[PDB]
């Protein structure tokens, strides 16, 4: 079992660091890596809104700054600690680093990433 | 009721315009708008690869340059005319402009975008 | 000489099509292509703000949907017709399609893109 | 007053973490924060190339995961340790967090970000 309480808690803590002067919408994420460490991320607004960095992308950056590996589970929350589903961009980028079986926290029942992004674009297409 | 042969054909034609010096992976897309017009897009490489524009995003730019509206159906194909599933980013972008019932071409049977991006991040989360 | 009045006017018209329910910040752009046609673009918000498409990127999509070519001059304006400098992302993407000598409209004196993005990242680095 | 040898070295070390199966172009970056700590980042390819994360953006994610603050100096290098100029997107992102006086390493003499992104798009435009 994944310690979802621990991941959700770490995601919430991460959200406190969000840089959101324009969106005012803090987001945090935390992921369990296959070596057992946890990496975290928060969103980062830009004045050109289309250059905004998602919390889940920040998690992926942290993954490869701290030794690499594969993601096993991820929780994403807003500033109030409510669980959020990743945006489509983040689903694709998370898939690169945890695949279809990466588990994504959900208010009712955590979901396989493969269910959140079925028939995904990928290597087979290139 | 959607002429998929027509949409797929226009997507194929669109792919011929692809700017792909670095990726060498041409993609074209075409979508039926709710006023009955068809809009098209192709991918555009950048030397900083993360600034690459997807065909499906190009379709959405075209949508709003030609009078706006809602997308009803989209086909995306590679340089060989083979049907591609949109990347996660494009699934999120297309959802904004066609919603869950937007149909996405597929080699077997076209799919609702809602099935390709379930429990999507959205307005309720902000 | 570039007909800046004409480009600025076309950029302003393009801004009217902006999809900006979240940012409320309409942007339009228009560019002269080296075959003499003008292509236009507007910005497109997404609920995931980081998937927002810039007007200038939309111009580049239009370029390669309408026969390709090179950009000679570009004007970008807000919803009030005031001239805007492109964001850094757009400077890089415009550079791919017009190079250092692409002229960018400015309230006082249009500027070479090479001056707006000096010592640019590019092919030499790859 | 900035130890460029130290920053360049940490950037080089950061590049070793790069996730670059598709681009094969490793990039690392390191920045001095105004509390005196150093944060690092590396690039991260995605199979949809337009979702690639730049090293410099990874630095900004790290900044806000480690207490926030302002960037004073940044070095960016390739896999061979050669100094790279940031792409336009990254120039805009870095400007948000270090402003015009943020120093950017360069093979000849480090440059003010204000000189690398003059007349930048910003808060005044919104
Ligand atoms: Zn996201
Ligand atoms: Zn895409
Ligand atoms: Zn822009
Ligand atoms: Zn960059």
Q: Pick the closest to residue D14 from A11, A61, B22 (CA basis).
A: A61
Tokens of A55: 């919390």
Residue B67 has a CB neighbour count (10 Å cut-off) of 11
CB contact under 8 A, B49 and D48: no
Q: How many CB pairs under 8 A join C and D?
A: 65
- Please give the distance, rounded to the nearest whole angstrom, from the Cα atom of residue D96 to the centre of ligand 2: 27
If residue A57 lies in a helix (H) or strand (E), which one and from where to where? Answer: helix A55-65
Taking the alpha carbons at both ends of chain A, their separation in whole angstroms is 35
A65 in reach of chain D (CB within 8 A): yes
Nearby residues for ligand 1 (ion, Cβ within 5 Å)? A 54, 87, 90
Tokens of A75: 């929780």
Give Cα A111 distance to the centre of its chain.
13
B45 in reach of chain A (CB within 8 A): no
Q: What is the resolution of this structure in A?
A: 1.8
* B52 three-state secondary structure: coil
d(CA C57, CA B111): 28
What's the CA angle centered on D90, arms D20 and A41, to 5 degrees? 70
Instruction: Answer yes or no: are the C-beta atoms of B125 and A84 closer than 8 Å.
Output: yes
If residue A126 lies in a helix (H) or strand (E), which one and from where to where? Answer: none
Can you spell out the DSSP letters for A69-118? --EEEEEEEETTS-B-PPPHHHHHHHHHHH-TT-EE--SSS-EEHHHHST
Which of C85-104 are b and which e, b meaning 16 or more Cβ less than 10 Å from the residue's Cβ?
bbbbbbbbbbbbbbbeebbb
A5 in reach of chain C (CB within 8 A): no
Name residue, tokens 């692409």.
Answer: C102
Residues in C touching B47 (Cβ below 8 Å): 92, 96, 121-123, 125-126
- Please give the distance, rounded to the nearest whole angstrom, from the Cα atom of residue B80 to the centre of ligand 3: 32
Q: Which ligand lies nearest the alpha carbon of A89?
A: 1
Q: How was this structure determined?
A: X-ray
**Whole-number CA gyration radius for chain D:** 14
B68 in reach of chain C (CB within 8 A): yes
**Whole-number CA gyration radius for chain B:** 14
| Helix and strand element counts for chain C (H, E) | 4, 5
Catalytic annotation, pick one of D56, D71, D90, D116: D56
CB contact under 8 A, D49 and B48: no
Instruction: Answer yes or no: are the C-beta atoms of B95 and B71 closer than 8 Å.
Output: no
Between the CA of residue A5 and those of A81, C2, D21, D47, what are the distances in Å? 11, 61, 34, 32
Q: Which domain holds residue B96?
A: 1-126
Q: Pick the closest to residue A56 from A123, A121, A11, A2 (CA basis).
A: A11
d(CA D110, CA D116): 11
**Which distant-in-sequence residues (6+ apart) come within 8 Å of B90 by Cβ?**
A88, B54, B56, B57, D48
Between the CA of residue A44 and those of A41, B93, D20, D34, D72, what are the distances in Å? 10, 19, 23, 18, 18
Residue B1 has a CB neighbour count (10 Å cut-off) of 6
d(CA A66, CA D114): 31
Residues in D touching A15 (Cβ below 8 Å): none
Go through chain A and tell me how many residues it has.
Answer: 126
CB contact under 8 A, C51 and A89: yes
d(CA B77, CA A15): 39
Q: Pick the closest to residue B75 from B104, B98, B101, B54 (CA basis).
A: B104
Residues in A touching C90 (Cβ below 8 Å): 48
User: Reading across the β-sheet that carries B27-33, which strands appear in turn?
Assistant: B38-42, B27-33, B71-78, B103-104, B111-112
H-assigned helices in chain B: 4-15, 55-65, 88-98, 113-116
**Which distant-in-sequence residues (6+ apart) come within 8 Å of A113 by Cβ?**
A91, A94, A95, A98, A99, A100, A101, A102, A103, A104
A78 in reach of chain C (CB within 8 A): no
Sign of CA dihedral B67, B73, B79, B84: positive
Instruction: Answer yes or no: are the C-beta atoms of D102 and D86 closer than 8 Å.
Output: no
Tell me how close the Cα of D25 comes to any Cα of chain C, in angstroms: 7
* D63 three-state secondary structure: helix
Which of B9-32 are b and which e, b meaning 16 or more Cβ less than 10 Å from the residue's Cβ?
ebbbebbebbbbebbebbbbbbbb
Residue C4 has a CB neighbour count (10 Å cut-off) of 16
Mutation target vs B (from D19, D45, D48; most B CBs, 10 A cutoff): D48
- Please give the distance, rounded to the nearest whole angstrom, from the Cα atom of residue B13 to the centre of ligand 2: 18
What's the CA angle centered on C120, arms C114 and D111, to 5 degrees? 100
Pairing mode, strands B103-104 and B71-78: parallel
CB contact under 8 A, A96 and D122: no
CATH number at residue B106: 3.40.140.10
If residue A17 lies in a helix (H) or strand (E), which one and from where to where? Answer: none
Instruction: Answer yes or no: are the C-beta atoms of A32 and A2 closer than 8 Å.
Output: yes
Number of domains chain D is built from: 1
B32 bridge partner residues: B38, B73
C47 in reach of chain B (CB within 8 A): yes
d(CA A81, CA A5): 11
User: Torsion over CA of B55, A90, D57 and C73, rounded to 10 degrees?
Assistant: 20
* C45 three-state secondary structure: coil
B88 in reach of chain D (CB within 8 A): yes
d(CA D32, CA D74): 6
d(CA B84, CA B77): 5
Instruction: Answer yes or no: are the C-beta atoms of A41 and D65 closer than 8 Å.
Output: yes
d(CA D125, CA D120): 10
Residue of C nearest to D23 (CA): C126
Residues in B touching A126 (Cβ below 8 Å): 25
Residues in C touching D118 (Cβ below 8 Å): 115-116, 118
d(CA A69, CA A75): 17
Tell me how close the Cα of C30 comes to any Cα of chain D, in angstroms: 18
Active site residue B101: no
* C44 three-state secondary structure: strand
């Amino acid at each position: 079992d994944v310690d979802w309480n621990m991941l959700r808690g770490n995601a919430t803590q991460a959200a406190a660091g969000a840089y959101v002067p324009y969106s005012r919408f803090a987001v945090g994420a935390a992921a369990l890596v296959d070596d057992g460490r946890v990496v975290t991320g928060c969103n980062v607004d830009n004045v050109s809104y289309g250059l905004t960095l998602c919390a889940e992308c920040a998690v992926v950056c942290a993954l490869h700054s701290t030794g690499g590996g594969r993601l096993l589970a991820l929780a994403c929350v807003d500033g109030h600690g409510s669980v959020l589903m990743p945006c489509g961009r983040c689903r694709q980028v998370l898939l690169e680093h945890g695949g279809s079986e990466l588990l994504i926290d959900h208010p009712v029942r955590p979901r396989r990433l493969g269910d959140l992004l079925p028939d995904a674009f990928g290597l087979d297409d290139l």
